[PDB]
Amino acid sequence: FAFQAEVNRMMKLIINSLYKNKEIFLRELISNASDALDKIRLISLTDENALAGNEELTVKIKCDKEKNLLHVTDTGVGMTREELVKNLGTIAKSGTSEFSTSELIGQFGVGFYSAFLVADKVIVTSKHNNDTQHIWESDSNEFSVIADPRGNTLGRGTTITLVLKEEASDYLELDTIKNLVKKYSQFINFPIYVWSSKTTVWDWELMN
Ligand SMILES: COC(=O)c1c(O)cc(O)c(C(=O)OC)c1CCc1nccn1Cc1ccccc1
């Protein structure tokens, strides 16, 4: 059906970004975090205390240069364990490959699959209201999900961790992330921060 139409759009956008410095993974990281924040703000209109777990609506990005990791943390609606298992309808549980999705592909396919332009794995730590906090890890093909051993550390929202390839080590430099976040967040209504350094003290720096 239209599942091939959205897949066609996804191939077009991901390969197009391969010419332009493979930056579409970061634009999608910011855009999807913004939509998740929009979702919980819409819910807070009906629910009185929908923000009781985390009363702030932010996007916070931190680089781990020595560990070669990229963290993007938003305080959006989050995802239940049942929502992590569904993901975007294309990732199966580990060991079950030999056994709608079109709407999930059209919205999240570009963001998920373009992350593997620079990352070997994609790890999702999410905390949704009325559910515990879980960790979800995928190799682009299969996934595995467990409950976070640390418990509820986000209050509410989602942290996307990208285990970057060494090929993409230059993305973790402060001046690189900051210029890229500033470019792709100038139209996001929510405040977006990057863990930056000032001389030496470290603190969140507003980028938009
Ligand atoms: C690939 O990271 C995301 O797309 C993503 C993000 O960057 C920031 C977020 O806050 C959230 C989020 O929690 O939205 C509530 C997501 C998940 C967006 C989503 N909502 C329903 C399905 N998906 C796609 C998906 C992909 C992999 C595993 C699970 C779900």
DSSP 93-131: ETT-S---HHHHIIIIIHHHHHGGGTEEEEEEEEE-TTS
Domain region containing 159? 1-208
**SS3 assignment, position 199:** coil
8 A C-beta contact, residue 127 and residue 176: no
Q: How far does residue 29's CA lie from ligand 1's centre (Å)?
A: 9
Distance from C-alpha of 59 to C-alpha of 151, rounded to nearest angstrom: 21
CA distance 117 to 158: 21
Q: Note whether 115 and 32 are within 8 A (CB).
A: no
Of 114, 101, 148, which Cα lies nearest the Cα of 4?
101
* Sign of the torsion formed by the C-alpha atoms of 65, 70, 73 and 78: negative
Per the listing, tokens 């609606």 go with: 77
Distance, CA of 143 to chain centre: 15
Which ranges of the chain does DSSP label H, i.e. alpha helix? 3-19, 24-46, 81-86, 101-104, 110-114, 174-184
**Could you tell me the CA-to-CA distances from 103 to 65, 72, 89 in Å, in that order?**
35, 24, 9
Residue type, 170: D
Q: Distance between the two ends of the chain, CA-based, in angstroms?
A: 40
Q: How far is CA 75 from the centre of its chain?
A: 11
What is the DSSP pairing of strand 59-64 with strand 69-74?
antiparallel
Position 139, amino acid: D
Helix (H) or strand (E) holding 143: strand 142-147
Q: What is the CATH number of the domain that holds 124?
A: 3.30.565.10
Number of domains the chain contains? 1
Q: Which two tokens stand for residue 117?
A: 């332009």
Tokens of 66: 């020595």
Residue 120 has which token pair? 């070997």
171 pocket-lining for ligand 1 (C-beta < 6 Å): no
The neighbouring-strand residues paired with 142 are 92
Instruction: In whole angstroms, give the CA distance from residue 177 to residue 104.
Output: 28
Partnered with residue 90 across adjacent β-strands are none
SS3 21: coil
Exposure letters 148-175 (e unless 16+ CB within 10 A, then b) = eeeeeebbbbbbbbbbbeeebeebbeee
Quote the tokens at residue 148: 């976070």
Contact 72, 172 (CB under 8 A): no
Q: Calculate the CA 76 to chain-centre distance.
A: 11
160 lines ligand 1 (CB under 6 A): yes
Does residue 79 have its Cβ closer than 6 Å to ligand 1? Answer: yes
Whole-number Å distance between alpha carbons of 147 and 133: 6
Distance from the CA of 95 to the center of ligand 1, in angstroms? 22
Best residue for ligand 1 mutational test, from 14, 32, 116, 137 (most atoms within 8 Å of Cβ) = 32
The DSSP output letter for 148 is: -
Residue type, 4: Q
Task: Enter the tokens of residue 53.
Answer: 């777990």
* Residue 204 CA to ligand 1 centre (angstroms): 23
The pair of three-digit structure tokens given for residue 27, joined into one six-digit string: 């634009």
The reply to whether ligand 1 has any atom less than 6 angstroms from the CB of 75 is no
Place of tokens 């999608």: 28
**Span from the CA of 108 to the centroid of ligand 1 (angstroms):** 7
